[PDB]
Structure formats: C-alpha cells, structure tokens
Amino acid sequence: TAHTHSAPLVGVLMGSSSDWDVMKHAVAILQEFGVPYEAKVVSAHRMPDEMFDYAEKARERGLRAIIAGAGGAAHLPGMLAAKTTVPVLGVPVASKYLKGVDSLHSIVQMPKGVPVATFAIGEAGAANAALFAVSILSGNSVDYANRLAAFRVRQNEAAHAMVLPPLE
Amino acid sequence: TAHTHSAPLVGVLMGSSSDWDVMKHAVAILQEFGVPYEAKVVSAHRMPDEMFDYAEKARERGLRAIIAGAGGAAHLPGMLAAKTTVPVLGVPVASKYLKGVDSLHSIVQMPKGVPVATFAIGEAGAANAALFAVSILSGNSVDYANRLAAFRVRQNEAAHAMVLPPLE
Amino acid sequence: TAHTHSAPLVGVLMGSSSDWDVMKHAVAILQEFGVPYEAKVVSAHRMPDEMFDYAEKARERGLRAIIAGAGGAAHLPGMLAAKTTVPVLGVPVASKYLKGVDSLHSIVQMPKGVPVATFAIGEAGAANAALFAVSILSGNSVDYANRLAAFRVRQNEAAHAMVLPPLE
Amino acid sequence: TAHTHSAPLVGVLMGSSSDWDVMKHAVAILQEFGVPYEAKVVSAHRMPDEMFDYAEKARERGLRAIIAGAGGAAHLPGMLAAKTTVPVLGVPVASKYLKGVDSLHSIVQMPKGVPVATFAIGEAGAANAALFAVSILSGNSVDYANRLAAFRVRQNEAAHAMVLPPLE
Amino acid sequence: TAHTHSAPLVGVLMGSSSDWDVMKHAVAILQEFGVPYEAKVVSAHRMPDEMFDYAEKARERGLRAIIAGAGGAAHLPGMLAAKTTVPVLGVPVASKYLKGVDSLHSIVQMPKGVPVATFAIGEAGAANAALFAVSILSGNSVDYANRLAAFRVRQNEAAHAMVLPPLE
Amino acid sequence: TAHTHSAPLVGVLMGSSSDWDVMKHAVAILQEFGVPYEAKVVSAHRMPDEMFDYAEKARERGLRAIIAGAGGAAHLPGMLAAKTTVPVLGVPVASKYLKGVDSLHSIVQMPKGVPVATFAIGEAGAANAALFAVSILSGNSVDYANRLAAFRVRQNEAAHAMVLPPLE
Amino acid sequence: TAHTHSAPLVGVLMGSSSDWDVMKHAVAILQEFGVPYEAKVVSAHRMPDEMFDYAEKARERGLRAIIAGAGGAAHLPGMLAAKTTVPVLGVPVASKYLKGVDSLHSIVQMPKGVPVATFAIGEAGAANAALFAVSILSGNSVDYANRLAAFRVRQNEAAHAMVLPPLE
Amino acid sequence: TAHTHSAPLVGVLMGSSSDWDVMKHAVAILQEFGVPYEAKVVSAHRMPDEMFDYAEKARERGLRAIIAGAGGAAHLPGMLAAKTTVPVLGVPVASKYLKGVDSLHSIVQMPKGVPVATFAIGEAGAANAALFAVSILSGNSVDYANRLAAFRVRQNEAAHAMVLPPLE
C-alpha cells in the first residue's frame, strides 16, 4: 500500500523490513522534497532474481537513482550497480557486532568499472543518500534546485538557533 | 593549460599534485567518454578561500559533478559539499601509514544534511567517481547512456577473454 | 583449455586472471588429490548474468563444491551461494590498501539463510578451501578419506624434519 | 539428556554453556531439517584431552561435520580440525570487548594444511554453519537436497511478504 | 546568554548543541580556572562561512586558543586551523557506530602545514583540551601557572585518598 | 585497611578505584590460592613519583610479581617494568570508546629491553594475571604447584558438569 | 653538540636515534623559524629517571613546549606530561607492524588531568608539532606571529604553483 | 643438535622454521644470559599430539618457562598452556596480510583459567619473552637478578651514547 508510485524518480531498496529503522530516513527526505518514489524489500541473497529484474527495468521505468541499504556482507548496492547504469547510492546499515564496518567495506570498495556512491553508516547515510538523489534531480529541475538551496539555508538557520545551556 | 575547458561538466580537484597518481584515473575515464572537464589543485588546508570560491561558482558555471580526492584528514570533499549543491564525489587517497583508512573515515562519515558520494580507496575509486559522473549525465543524455552501455559490453567482453594459465 | 573437465567435482572461480596468483594454490591441491575440477574467470560485477548461470547449473552438473575467490567488495562467493545449494567456499583475496580486511568482511559476514564457508586471506585460504573440498568428498569416498590421511602423515613428517640453525 | 543421538551426522560443540545463546541457533536448524545430531560442551582450554578424543573418534562414529563455536582466543575449531579430517565448521562467538573480531581472527586465519570453514560472527554464523552442514549432507541425499531447496523458496516467499509501513 | 565574554582568551566551539554533553567538560575546567571564555555552536558543514569568519577574527579579538569538538567526518578543528594561526585544540566526539575512531582520524591526521593539537576521544579530551589551554596561558601568567601546579597536587592527593574495598 | 600484608608476594596496582571492578578478579584469585598480597591505587599519571618508588622497592620487599591494570593510554605496567626487574603482569582495562584496544596496544607493544607480560582485556586478564603469578610462585613452592594442579582439575570437572538445555 | 642551546624555548625528545628520521622534521621547522631549541635522546623505558629529571626542570629552564616522539607502547609524551605543566606535544612514530596505530593510541588517549597534544603519525606530525610550538610562542610574540603568517602565504603560493601534467 | 640441553630451564617453540627469523631473538637473549635452553619446531596444527606431549612433560623436566611463537590463527601458546602449569610466554609472529593483528588476538585473549603471558608482535616480543623468563628465574636466583641489573645498566649507557646528527 505505502511507498508506491506510478512514475517514481527514486527507488529505495533494502533486504529486510528490519532495515526500515534506518532506510525510513531516506524516505522522509524524499517525501519532504516531494520526489516521486517507491520503497521495496529486495534482498540480494533471498531475492537474487528479483534484484536483477529491478535493476534491468530501472532506466526504462524512469528511475534516476536507486538508494539501497544493506548490512554485514552487504551486496545489494554493488549487484544492483552491476545490472543497471542508473546511479546506485549505497547506505551501510550497522551490523550487530561489527557496527557497520563490514557493511561499509562491502559497499564502498567496488573495483573499477561498477561504481556505488557510498554514504555514512546508518540513518545519516540514509538521509544523505536521499539528499544526494535530490542533487542529481536538480541538474535538470529548477524546482528541485530551489528546494535544495532552501533546505541548506534552513539548516544554517537551525544551527544558528541552537543554544548551549549553563553548566548545571 | 592541460585539463581546462571553457564549459566543463565535471571538475576533478585534489589538494596536491602528489594526488595525481590516483586522480589521473578519473581524468582518463572523462577523456574516454568525451566529457568536458577541468582538473585543478585546490587544497582544503593551504587554499581554504579558493576552495570556497570554487564550490560557490560550481552551479552557475554548469558543473554537474565535482570529483574531489584527498588523503589523511581528508576535508576537501566535505567542505566543497558544504558550499555547493552540485553533487560531490569523494575519492579517498591512500595515506602512507593508515593506507587510506583515515581518508575513508574523513570523507564517507558526513553527518545528515551535507552528502558526499564516496568511492573506493585509491585508483579504483577515482575511475569509479568519473564513471558515476557519467551515470549522472546519462540521466538526461541519451549519448552518455549509450556510451555507458557500450563500456559495459566492452568490460564484459574483456572478462570473457581472460585466460588462466597452467600451473608452472 | 587449461583447467577443464567433462565431469568436474569442484569449480574454482575468480573475478579476474589477476586473482590466479592466489587461486592457483587451490588448483594445486585439487591436482595433487586427483580431484576432477574446472577453473574459470567469472566476475560478479562484469559478468553478473554468467555468475547466476554458473550457480544455477552447478548442482545438475554434479559439482560438490564451488571455490570462489574475490577481493575488496568481494561479492562473488555470496552471490553464487544465493543462487545454488551446492557448498560455496569463499577465499578472500588481499586488496591493495586494506590487505583483505574488506575482502574478509564481504565474504564471511553472510546473514542467516545463505552460508559461505570462509577461509584465510590469500594463498593459505585458497589451498585450505581445496583441502576442505576434499574433506567434503571424503564424506562418501574411502579413496578421498585415504588421501587426506596420507597428506596429514606427510605434513607431520615434514614438520618433524624442519631444522633450526645456529645463530649467525 | 537433550541433544544426544545414537547415530549423529553433525556434532555441535562449544567451550561453555554460556555459548548456548549463540549455538542453539545451529541446533534449531538441525532440528528443523531432521538431521540426527548431538550438542556437547567441549572446551579447548579446560578439556584439551577430551577435545582430542572427540576429534579422533568423529569419522568412525559417522560424523559428517563438526560445528564448533568459540570466542576470544578461539582455538576449539582449529584444534578439532588438527585431529580429524571430517569437515569442521567454525562459528566465532562474540566476545565482551572486541565483539568477536578476536574470535573471527583466531578461527578463519588457519595456515595451509588444516582448514576450518568459518561463518559470520554470532547467531547468523551458528544458523549458517548448520545450513552448510545440510548442504554437505545433500551431496548424497535427495531428502536433504529437497529440504534445502524448499527452505530457500520459503525464505524467498517470506521476503516477498515483508511490508514497509507508512512513516509515523 | 551563557558562555559569553567581552574579552575571551579561549573559544569553545562545536557543530551542534548535541556535542554539549562532551564539550561542557572543557567549559567546566575553564570556569574552575577562572579563564575568560566563550562557547558557541559553529558547524563546519552547516555554517561554513561563519566558521571562516570566526577563525579570521580570532587573533585580533585576543583568543589564545580555540577548542573545537566534532564527530564523524570531523572537519571543524582542521578548517579553523586552516584559517587562523592561533592554536587549535581538537576534541574527537564519539560517533554512534564507529565510537569516535572516525572522529579521531579526521582530526589528528592533519598534513604538514596546518596543525591541530588532538586530545582523547570524548569527555576526557574535552577536559584535557581545556587543561592544555591553561598550560598555554601559564607561559605568561604566574596566576595560571600557580593554579595549574595546585591542580596537579590536588589530583595527586585525590588519588592517594582512594580506597579499595574488601571483596564482597 | 583491606588488601595489606607485612610480607606480600604479589602486588596488585591500578590507577583508580574505578579500575577495581576489573582488578578485584585478580585479588579474588590471590585470596583463593592463599597468596600473601597487597592491592593499592598507584596512578602512572597522577602519582608518577610514587609509581617509581613502588617499583624501586619491590624486589627488596620480597615481591615476586606486580599485577598492574590500566586503560586508555595505559602506561602504568610499562613504567613499573622500566623501574624494576621483578616480573610485571599487565592487565588492559577496557576504555569507554575504544573498548580496550588502546589499553592493549599501550601495554603489549613494549620495545626490546623492558618486558611486560600482557593478558586479556578486562576481568579475564585480571584473573589470568593472578593465576600466572601463582604459576611463577609454583616454580619454588610445592604448595602453590599443588594448588594450581588442583585448580586445573576442578576447572575440567566444572566444564564436564555443564548442561545444554532443550530448545525452548 | 648538534642541537643544543643555552636558552632553548622548545625541546625535541625521542627514545632512540632511530626516531630521528621522523623527528628531524620538527627540528627543520624550528630552525626555519629561528626558534632556540635542543634535541635529545631520552628514553621512557631505558632512561626513566632521566626522563623525569628532564620534565622536572623544563619549566624553570624556560621551555615553552616539549615535542616528544615515540612508537609502539609510546609512553614518553604521557610520562613527560605527568611530570611537567609545560605543554607536551606528542608525535606518534610509526611502528614496524602496526604502522603507528599503537603509537597513536598510546599517546592521544590520555585520561583527564594530564593532557598531551597529539599530532599525525610520522613526519607530518613532527613538522606540525613544531609549527604548533611556534603558534604557542606567537601568543605573546609579534615576531613569531609574523613568521607564521609569512609561512602560510608561502604555503598558499606553493599550492597555486603546482601543475597537473597530461596523461601519458 | 643446535639448541639442545640436557637440563633446559627455558624451551623456545615455534610451528615452523619460518618463524626462526623472529624467534632467534629470544634464543639470543638466553645465550647472552647463560640460560640453559632448548629450541624446537612444534606445530599446533601439524604436530598436535607432540605439542600435548611437550607440555605434559615440561614441569617434570624442570622447565621454568616455555616461550612459544605463532602467527595467524596462533594456537600454539594457548594449547601448550592448556596442558601445563609451567608459565607460557606467547610471541605473536607477524602474518603476511594482517601484520600480526590476528596473531595478537589469537594469543592474548585467553579466557579465565588458562593464562598466556603475551609480548609485542615480532622480534621485540621474542627478545622480551626471553628477558621475562630471566626475570622469572631471578625470583630465586641472585645470579640471574645480578645479570638483569647489569643488562639494564648496559641499556641505559647505550641510550646515553646515542647521537643525533645535523640536518643534511
């Protein structure tokens, strides 16, 4: 029901609904910016064929970026990237024991020929992958360009408004 | 004089000519794909004002991506991204002692609000940042989409042609 | 032409001929033990369809193990295992900067449901994956059990024969 | 009382009953698949002679795999493997301070001659060691082959059934 | 309101009020020692222009040290140091997933030309940056020299007064 | 009052009463084995002179081992060792952010000439340092030799008595 | 004979002449800036009394900073700082196996109460510790402030002069 | 033939003659101090039974310490310690890819009950393990106490004699 669109510009993928705690931060940004999007559970290891199918159809469906979150032996971003030339934006989800060090290594260290744009471990990287998608869309949209400029100014204002309290 | 253009679509920046050994791999991809580009030495720490000026002007100049390489306490990608909404693509350059672990941390771990798309440590990341820039351009260019598709066919063919010799 | 068989029991795969320096150590064990084998270049990222096709066909072809080596964002073992129930034996190949730490994380940290048996970084792991494949065959082969036992006696004798020289 | 069998095919060993929180996930898989098994506390450091005896007897008793978990200076899998040619499947149990990095290093880094198939840190690796054991058994059992294929399809269906909720 | 002065000798900066939990330990020391100080939220990424302005003005305002805390891709201390020759004292704030390893790398690994004096991860480093500031001021103040000597003796007395209880 | 003796054979030192949570495990072993001991707060950084004094007097007082715990930039074991030839047994106490990785590096990595026998991070290393002290004392005491032999047999019995419960 | 002064403002210390390859970079800066300095071999572990004597006398002798380099279990900076209130500037020297990771932990992770200002691993940190000492002197010297400003202009000019060559 | 004694006080063990490059540094100290010693190749994985036999016999043979070097999944020190109450002194030998990080984890992280005294990675640790053995013997030998004291005087004198040359 939720997170569907007939003409999405950004897809948000993850291997499990357990990743939603992190990946929902990507979706929050896309909603805030009014970007047509979809969010789907697509597992590299449990849904390998479906992963390949998604990547194959991405460009013809009009996707401009795929945001993909994964943890541990995190293969979903790199394997999507292997099967489409549409930009893939990888979000390392923190793992229980290695705290996303494994996730980060498995995503960022792509060999020459198949890039994955990688962001910070966890909720920061999820939000930033979405913001980065908006920066891609702003390359040919005054609306997204304007919204991103306004977002930065608002962020700057919010930092100015912060207050440090007296020592207790 | 080398690496200038009157209308670049991608800028390739680094803090020192010592970084060229890595960053030349990005320039090689841009030349191969026929992407108008510029390459410049812009140091976060020795040229802070110049860094800010470059980022300020990137959007009005028509840049569609800035590829930025740095090592150690690698601040150039993040501080460019702080000052422009043009996509910033960060390449960790390996450091002498920590082998780019410091570089990678310094670039990828950006807090929410100011994204840097991060690629592999070293030459692989430099080439991939450039290939990723081409994917960005392919969002609204059939020519760049076709060039990427042809590149991938060539890559696949080259992998098929590889040979494993007898044990010696 | 080198490294083919009409009825292999073990397949040795790697993403590039550059991995042969490590993966040849697996092939040496297989030859020593008289195990019918094939060795092939199959890249997760440059040959994704071919990788899936190889895994799909592994069981019907009679393969009892697939030894797969990869480095960096090492996806080949995990994605083979996503597509076959034949045992997959992963060999992390050392990477230029991270020395196989990235390779190891990328292979061993598979989530529940899709196992990869992982061995040491480099040449030791390649030789051990092959020796482990022989242990798998020894489950229902007295011949292979006997060969392993004889290998271990030779190993033990070789250790006993080692000599520690005078200080110089 | 629990976890005994007169003709086990898989042994599940650990140094302490404190390791049961992790290793019970191996036993759950073995039960689900109907694999005859035993689970025992066998400590490398507090029961060294008993560890040797277990390994010595494994093949003649009909064990096809030994799943062994250990944490810290984790020696149990490698020392079992030194004393039997039956497949040894090592599970790094996370340690209090190093979160299983020490465990992983102590298990996976076996030198050439004595392999240990290593799986992910913690409960994922325990479950996967057991799944891998089932894959070994499927090499000569249609029942285990069928059960494993059915398991994979069930996992795929479960991923398809996952739902991402609306933002709250 | 709080943490202002018309003639501060030490500035305490951080990217967010969320960093106060750590950086308040710097302020506690400055208060205890009677050092005129100010504390301000100045974000490298959300307030880049303001960061440059602060550094530009530091010497002429009479600042003798700037204590700056940041976490993750921690750029605030190094970018302040790029824009002033007043001593910059960097405090790595621990990050959620990497526990300040990223913070430390991003601060301490400055290349030749632009130093940042770096202290321990977290509250210990915040307190110590402030103590170090006092040591700088003691170079031309008998009052600060005396206070620092008295502090050290008091610390020594406090350690002498510690009691180890009986086993319970 | 507690943890004094007129003729101790082992001293247990730590920089703060906060280390007692860990170091009390050393004292528990020494009490169990009936070893004359003392435990004292001696800080490398807050009590440097007192640390040197303790080490200077150790041999003439009859100490046979000094167990020293420290965390972070952990200098107490190495500096005791610099000032006495009596065996120094170092226990890395886990730090808040780096979980004792820093503690371990600062203790174990002593250069040639001044050894520190180093044990596991935390309570395990504290207990083991004390057990190791007993092994030193057993070199010339049948009583300590016997007690250590009996301890090992009891440990073996305790491991035998462990029970793995049914799956719930 | 080399590296002495009757009235040094900065002392450069290291545990061995083998550290000179790194620490000479500090001395080069001090010479360039005309800072009266001394350089000495003072080992924490082989010369512990001498280290304490040096720290004790630092303040009365007029020293404004002590630059101290050490590697491995690097105790020299911290133990100097335990014994003087003169600013101590620590330089981690890379170690053979751990590449200065151990050195860095050992120096930077000082507990509250005894600060060490820590710089980058190796030659960069040595040069920066010296440049930081000049910043300390610039607090109450127009001459040293002027020299720093001129250094930064030269740095900036040198960066502008760098050239990126054609691809070969 | 080299490195034998009819009444050794220290045994120096390693899993391969390849380890001699490191372990010879221990033997050099033993020879210098006149300690009766033996050195042997005893492999945990290739000679498991022989390892157990050596440890079983160590105490009745009069050994006062066993120095054991190993790398990678380094089990030799721990498994010796599991089988004897004679002090075991572990030397991590650097591994090809992980540079002894694996070796160190595998040796130092022993659980409560079975201690291994651990020294630095490589040659420094081998020399120090031997020096530590001499400290053990010094507990009830005035000759060995005097030899250690003389060694330390020599070390101190050698440090004083070191010279720092002019800048080139």
Q: To the nearest 5 percent, what fractions of chain E are helix, strand and coil?
A: 50, 15, 35
Q: What is the DSSP letter of G97?
A: T
Question: Which residues, at least 6 apart from D18, have a Cβ–Cβ distance to it below 8 Å?
Answer: none
Consecutive H or E run containing D69: strand D65-70
What are the phi and psi torsion angles at B91 (to 5°)?
-115, 110
**Shortest Cα distance, chain B CAs vs residue A72, angstroms:** 17
Nearest CA-CA partner of G41 in G30, G32, G28, G54: G54
Do C44 and C75 touch, CB atoms closer than 8 A? yes
Alpha-carbon span B106 to B124, nearest angstrom: 18
| Option in D99, D122, D164 nearest A17 (CB) | D164
Query: What 3 state SS string does chain C have?
Result: CCCCCCCCCEEEEECCHHHHHHHHHHHHHHHHCCCCEEEEECCCCCCHHHHHHHHHHHCCCCCCEEEEEEECCCCHHHHHHHHCCCCEEEEEECCCCCCCHHHHHHHHCCCCCCCCEECCCCHHHHHHHHHHHHHHHCCCCHHHHHHHHHHHHHHHHHHHHCCCCCCC
Long-range contacts of D30-35 (CB under 8 A, 24+ apart): D30/D130, D30/D133, D30/D134, D31/F167, D33/D130, D33/D134, D33/D144, D33/D147, D33/D148, D33/D151, D34/D147, D35/D9, D35/D10, D35/D130, D35/D133, D35/D134, D35/D137, D35/D144
For residue A11, the cross-strand partners are: A38, A66
Residues of G in contact with H158 (CB under 8 A): 46
Nearest CA-CA partner of H71 in H43, H52, H48: H43
Assign residue G100 a region (left: φ > 0; alpha: ψ between -120 and 50; beta: otherwise). Answer: left
Do C134 and C33 touch, CB atoms closer than 8 A? yes
The answer to whether F160 faces chain D, any CB pair under 8 Å, is: yes
Experimental method: X-ray
Residues of E in contact with G127 (CB under 8 A): 112-113
Do D115 and C89 touch, CB atoms closer than 8 A? no
Alpha-carbon span B93 to D54, nearest angstrom: 51
Pairs across C and D, CB distance < 8 A: 116
The answer to whether G124 faces chain F, any CB pair under 8 Å, is: no
Range of the domain at E133: 1-168
| Option in A64, A109, A123 nearest B139 (CB) | A64
Do H10 and H65 touch, CB atoms closer than 8 A? yes
Alpha-carbon span E74 to G115, nearest angstrom: 21
For residue F92, the cross-strand partners are: F70
Q: What is the DSSP letter of A97?
A: T
Do A107 and A119 touch, CB atoms closer than 8 A? no
Alpha-carbon span D12 to D88, nearest angstrom: 10
Alpha-carbon span E22 to E18, nearest angstrom: 9
Nearest CA-CA partner of C31 in C15, C10, C45: C10
Q: What is the DSSP letter of F15?
A: S
Tokens of C41: 């270049």
The answer to whether F114 faces chain G, any CB pair under 8 Å, is: yes
Do C89 and C62 touch, CB atoms closer than 8 A? no
Nearest CA-CA partner of C83 in C105, C109, C50: C50
* CA distances, D80 to each of D12, D116, D123, H137 (Å): 12, 9, 21, 35
Alpha-carbon span C66 to C82, nearest angstrom: 13
Alpha-carbon span E22 to E123, nearest angstrom: 5
Nearest CA-CA partner of F118 in F145, F154, F92: F92
- Interchain pair A159, E20: CB under 8 A: no
Do B36 and B27 touch, CB atoms closer than 8 A? no
- Interchain pair G120, B72: CB under 8 A: yes
Tokens of G118: 């820590």
Domain count, chain D: 1
Instruction: Give the residue from chain C lying closest to H12, CA to CA.
Output: C164
Three-state secondary structure call for residue B39:
strand
Amino acid at D4: T
Question: Which residues, at least 6 apart from D95, have a Cβ–Cβ distance to it below 8 Å?
Answer: D71, D72, D101, D102, D103, H109
Alpha-carbon span G73 to F92, nearest angstrom: 13
Do B85 and A135 touch, CB atoms closer than 8 A? yes
Do C13 and C66 touch, CB atoms closer than 8 A? yes
Chain E neighbors (3+ CB pairs < 8 Å): A, B, F, G
Alpha-carbon span C1 to C10, nearest angstrom: 16
What are the phi and psi torsion angles at C14 (to 5°)?
-160, 155
- Interchain pair H45, D113: CB under 8 A: yes
* Helix-helix angle F123-137:F20-32, to 10 degrees: 30
The answer to whether A108 faces chain E, any CB pair under 8 Å, is: no
Tokens of C124: 């030791």
Can you tell me which residue has the tokens 């250790």? Answer: C159
**Residue F162: CB atoms within 10 Å:** 18
Burial pattern B96-106, b for ≥16 Cβ within 10 A else e, equals: bbbbbbbbbbb
Do E79 and B79 touch, CB atoms closer than 8 A? yes
The answer to whether E28 faces chain A, any CB pair under 8 Å, is: yes
Three-state secondary structure call for residue F117:
strand
Do F137 and F131 touch, CB atoms closer than 8 A? no
Can you tell me which residue has the tokens 């200065």? Answer: G100
**Shortest Cα distance, chain G CAs vs residue F25, angstroms:** 23
The answer to whether A118 faces chain B, any CB pair under 8 Å, is: yes
Torsion G137-G140-G145-G147 (CA) sign: negative
* CA distances, D153 to each of A13, D148, D149, D158, G56 (Å): 20, 9, 6, 9, 74
* CA distances, B117 to each of A10, A132, B87, E97, H144 (Å): 16, 8, 8, 19, 62
What are the phi and psi torsion angles at G118 (to 5°)?
-110, 140
Instruction: Give the residue from chain B lying closest to G119, CA to CA.
Output: B73
Do E160 and F17 touch, CB atoms closer than 8 A? no
Catalogue the E-assigned strands of chain E: 10-14, 37-41, 65-70, 88-92, 117-118
Tokens of C6: 């009409």
Q: What is the resolution of this structure in A?
A: 1.9
Alpha-carbon span D62 to D53, nearest angstrom: 15
Residues of H in contact with D74 (CB under 8 A): 106
Question: Which residues, at least 6 apart from D142, have a Cβ–Cβ distance to it below 8 Å?
Answer: none
* CA distances, E136 to each of C83, E25, E145 (Å): 64, 18, 9
Give the neighbor-by-neighbor strand order of the sheet with A88-93: A37-41, A10-14, A65-71, A88-93, A117-118, B117-118, B88-93, B65-71, B10-14, B37-41
Chain F neighbors (3+ CB pairs < 8 Å): D, E, G, H
The answer to whether H163 faces chain G, any CB pair under 8 Å, is: yes
| Option in H39, H41, H72 nearest C120 (CB) | H72
- CATH number, domain containing residue A4: 3.40.50.1970
Alpha-carbon span E40 to E30, nearest angstrom: 14
Instruction: Give the residue from chain F lying closest to H126, CA to CA.
Output: F112
Nearest CA-CA partner of B137 in B85, B70, B64: B64
The answer to whether F89 faces chain H, any CB pair under 8 Å, is: yes
Do C6 and B149 touch, CB atoms closer than 8 A? no
The answer to whether E107 faces chain G, any CB pair under 8 Å, is: no
Tokens of G46: 């082989």
Residue A128 CB-half CA count within 13 A: 31
Can you tell me which residue has the tokens 């800072």? Answer: G35
| Chains B and D, touching by 3 or more CB pairs within 8 angstroms | no
Instruction: Give the residue from chain F lying closest to D98, CA to CA.
Output: F99
Nearest CA-CA partner of E11 in E41, E47, E50: E41
**Shortest Cα distance, chain C CAs vs residue A47, angstroms:** 8
> Preceding residues of all breaks in chain D (C to N beyond 2.5 angstroms)?
none
The answer to whether H23 faces chain F, any CB pair under 8 Å, is: no
Alpha-carbon span D22 to D67, nearest angstrom: 12
**Residue H150: CB atoms within 10 Å:** 11
- DSSP-assigned letters across all residues of H88-115: EEEEEEPPTTTTTHHHHHHHH-PPTTS-
For residue F71, the cross-strand partners are: F93
Tokens of A60: 């013809």
* E46 marked as part of a ligand binding site: yes
The answer to whether C121 faces chain H, any CB pair under 8 Å, is: yes
The answer to whether D52 faces chain F, any CB pair under 8 Å, is: no
- DSSP-assigned letters across all residues of F137-164: HGGG-HHHHHHHHHHHHHHHHHHHT--P
| Chains H and A, touching by 3 or more CB pairs within 8 angstroms | no
Alpha-carbon span C32 to C22, nearest angstrom: 17
The answer to whether A106 faces chain C, any CB pair under 8 Å, is: yes
Instruction: Give the residue from chain G lying closest to F79, CA to CA.
Output: G45
Torsion H21-H26-H29-H31 (CA) sign: negative
Alpha-carbon span C137 to C154, nearest angstrom: 20
- Interchain pair G122, B41: CB under 8 A: no
Do E36 and E5 touch, CB atoms closer than 8 A? yes
Alpha-carbon span D12 to D126, nearest angstrom: 10
Instruction: Give the residue from chain E lying closest to B95, CA to CA.
Output: E109
Q: What is the DSSP letter of G115?
A: -
Q: Which of E47, E75, E93 to mutate to test the interface with B (most CBs of B within 10 A)?
A: E75
Three-state secondary structure call for residue F90:
strand
Torsion E123-E126-E130-E136 (CA) sign: positive
* A16 marked as part of a ligand binding site: yes
Alpha-carbon span A116 to A98, nearest angstrom: 21
Nearest CA-CA partner of F79 in F63, F95, F90, F94: F90
Tokens of C99: 């020395």
Tokens of H67: 């120095």
Tokens of G166: 């054609």
Alpha-carbon span C77 to C89, nearest angstrom: 7
The answer to whether C74 faces chain H, any CB pair under 8 Å, is: no
Residues of H in contact with D75 (CB under 8 A): 75, 78-79, 106
Q: What is the DSSP letter of D77?
A: H
Alpha-carbon span H41 to H51, nearest angstrom: 10
Pairs across E and G, CB distance < 8 A: 116
Tokens of A102: 């494994």
Tokens of E139: 């170079």
The answer to whether E45 faces chain B, any CB pair under 8 Å, is: yes
Can you tell me which residue has the tokens 């003392």? Answer: F38
Nearest CA-CA partner of B120 in B131, B110, B112, B134: B131
Amino acid at C6: S
